[PDB]
Amino acid sequence: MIVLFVDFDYFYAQVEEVLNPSLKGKPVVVCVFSGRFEDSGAVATANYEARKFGVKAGIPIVEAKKILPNAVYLPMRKEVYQQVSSRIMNLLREYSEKIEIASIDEAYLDISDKVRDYREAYNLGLEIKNKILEKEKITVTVGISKNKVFAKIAADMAKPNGIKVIDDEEVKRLIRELDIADVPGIGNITAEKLKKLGINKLVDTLSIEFDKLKGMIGEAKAKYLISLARDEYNEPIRTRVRKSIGRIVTMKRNSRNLEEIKPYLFRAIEESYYKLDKRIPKAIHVVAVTEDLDIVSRGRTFPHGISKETAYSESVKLLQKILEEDERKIRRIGVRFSKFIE
DNA sequence: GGGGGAAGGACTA
DNA sequence: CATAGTCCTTCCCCC
Ligand SMILES: [Ca+2]
Ligand SMILES: [Ca+2]
Ligand SMILES: [Ca+2]
């Protein structure tokens, strides 16, 4: 199998650079201003000019400002990035039918039937990079290998504006030399737990009692790392299997005023439909988190399929039913979609 | 056997 | 609640 992975480089910040070219070359830091007080919140993504000085994903905005007081700090514009992202995903759609959109900034293409080998996979990666740069002026990094995991690792290694193939032999080498912390889906907490079991490489998970490994990190992650270590990993590039897809936004002030709530609910729906993409729900649940943090929800099933605009109007009715049946103010409001058609 | 929902955990998917 | 959101983990009801 030949898998080609694409990640859009320092995406939120790059998009901002594209919408305002004067920012290029200067440190740029997109942040999620949490609203608790001036500069509360954490950095979402920073460009490389900012990473040079340690400003990066997840550190407090207040700290970023101490290290780089004169950088350009911008608020998160999730909607803008989703729109720019969907267009890029549409371009990727031209290169393969088997595509798996993983998040707003990345996707996997199974190109097993479009190319005969890595040399051709590589030329295709350059084509793709050139297409996106041409259409949207956004640089991306391509990772190519025998499965999803190694294709992503290659992009992580080659970024930004890069391309890299990890052939079968290097896969065998990496299974032995790759810090476990660098494996997709594996974060710090799990990394630390394994360090403590004296595990630092994929290969290491092959010399420990499965039940001892499972006991520390869960069955799913234990099988996972193991199937990789045995170069036995092979999961299809399939549209992800999801129970429900939703979004819950925290409002600025608790409320029970139908008109005041609406906007937030709609932003929730908007975002939700962007995340649903081709998937079509039959069920919609409106979800409210009350002032005292209780969860209240009212849903409805539609034998046909729920269009975005129908979700807009049917949710409002569900929201009204909630207000009539619970007199508490609402703090957070959102929606959930489930039971998809095939 | 596994869908799928509740509530807390871990990853940036 | 106390960086937010997304997705994962564990457990239990239920088909
Ligand atoms: Ca990225
Ligand atoms: Ca990414
Ligand atoms: Ca990452």
Side-chain angles (χ1 to χ4, degrees):
Chain A
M1 187 184 36
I2 301 173
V3 178
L4 188 154
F5 174 86
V6 183
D7 172 80
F8 317 150
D9 311 324
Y10 60 105
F11 195 50
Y12 308 159
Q14 201 191 333
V15 165
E16 291 297 355
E17 298 188 333
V18 164
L19 266 56
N20 180 354
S22 75
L23 302 171
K24 269 207 70 108
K26 313 173 173 199
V28 180
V29 185
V30 173
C31 313
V32 170
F33 288 92
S34 63
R36 307 196 150 70
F37 53 80
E38 168 137 287
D39 289 332
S40 68
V43 173
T45 126
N47 65 11
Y48 286 80
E49 279 65 38
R51 299 178 197 188
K52 171 177 193 182
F53 301 99
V55 173
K56 57 176 150 71
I59 71 171
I61 292 167
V62 157
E63 282 309 301
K65 286 192 174 187
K66 286 173 191 153
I67 305 167
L68 283 187
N70 312 302
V72 178
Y73 289 83
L74 306 163
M76 247 260 229
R77 295 192 296 159
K78 203 53 171 282
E79 302 176 357
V80 176
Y81 318 141
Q82 288 164 321
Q83 281 172 25
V84 171
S85 170
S86 59
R87 296 196 307 264
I88 298 169
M89 296 301 169
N90 283 332
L91 304 167
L92 297 175
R93 274 166 203 298
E94 298 317 303
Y95 298 97
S96 183
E97 331 79 56
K98 299 167 196 172
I99 184 177
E100 176 179 339
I101 299 186
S103 74
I104 185 171
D105 89 337
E106 71 198 48
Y108 299 77
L109 278 59
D110 179 330
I111 58 168
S112 285
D113 306 313
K114 300 274 173 181
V115 300
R116 285 163 296 192
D117 55 30
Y118 289 147
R119 175 165 94 78
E120 258 164 51
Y122 193 98
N123 292 332
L124 188 57
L126 293 174
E127 209 170 301
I128 286 166
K129 287 166 51 69
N130 287 332
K131 177 59 75 190
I132 300 170
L133 184 70
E134 174 195 287
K135 292 310 192 190
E136 307 280 354
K137 293 270 112 47
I138 288 287
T139 63
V140 312
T141 286
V142 173
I144 293 159
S145 196
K146 61 190 296 205
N147 65 39
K148 289 194 287 174
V149 178
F150 288 101
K152 180 162 177 167
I153 283 146
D156 284 335
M157 283 173 19
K159 75 183 192 170
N161 192 12
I163 182 164
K164 175 165 186 95
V165 165
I166 290 179
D167 65 23
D168 285 45
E169 189 184 358
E170 155 135 69
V171 164
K172 284 181 56 180
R173 302 184 183 186
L174 291 181
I175 281 168
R176 304 183 243 94
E177 305 179 358
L178 195 62
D179 208 325
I180 251 182
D182 296 323
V183 174
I186 302 303
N188 262 273
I189 293 162
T190 294
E192 211 46 56
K193 290 180 185 158
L194 304 174
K195 186 176 168 183
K196 180 163 301 183
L197 282 164
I199 293 195
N200 316 294
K201 316 283 168 171
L202 282 170
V203 53
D204 298 351
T205 74
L206 292 192
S207 59
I208 186 174
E209 189 63 15
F210 178 83
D211 291 300
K212 203 183 179 193
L213 186 68
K214 165 185 179 176
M216 209 34 65
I217 72 185
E219 178 171 55
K221 280 174 179 59
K223 289 172 149 199
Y224 181 67
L225 296 176
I226 284 172
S227 73
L228 284 160
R230 288 173 179 169
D231 202 342
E232 239 131 54
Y233 183 103
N234 184 299
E235 296 276 79
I237 281 61
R238 184 198 182 180
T239 298
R240 206 62 183 186
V241 215
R242 293 281 155 91
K243 300 185 173 182
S244 65
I245 288 178
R247 179 72 257 241
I248 299 183
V249 306
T250 291
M251 303 181 295
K252 235 96 190 195
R253 88 149 195 277
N254 292 351
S255 158
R256 37 186 295 111
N257 186 296
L258 194 56
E259 281 314 305
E260 171 165 31
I261 297 180
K262 271 179 177 187
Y264 297 103
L265 167 61
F266 293 158
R267 233 169 310 188
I269 296 179
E270 263 295 273
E271 283 194 31
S272 291
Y273 268 83
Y274 167 80
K275 287 196 295 169
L276 280 169
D277 196 21
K278 311 317 181 159
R279 293 173 266 253
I280 281 299
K282 282 210 294 292
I284 182 176
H285 281 292
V286 161
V287 188
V289 176
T290 66
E291 51 199 325
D292 55 324
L293 302 183
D294 181 25
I295 302 175
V296 192
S297 58
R298 293 288 187 278
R300 188 177 181 176
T301 292
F302 297 63
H304 43 290
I306 305 174
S307 77
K308 197 229 292 198
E309 303 79 14
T310 276
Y312 269 93
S313 57
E314 184 61 41
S315 71
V316 169
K317 294 177 191 170
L318 291 170
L319 173 56
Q320 283 162 318
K321 193 200 284 162
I322 284 175
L323 273 344
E324 299 161 358
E325 301 181 29
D326 201 302
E327 284 176 48
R328 291 179 288 184
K329 293 195 177 174
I330 304 177
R331 176 147 165 50
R332 306 173 193 139
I333 188 64
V335 72
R336 181 188 177 180
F337 295 95
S338 65
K339 314 204 198 107
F340 311 110
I341 299 169
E342 301 183 2

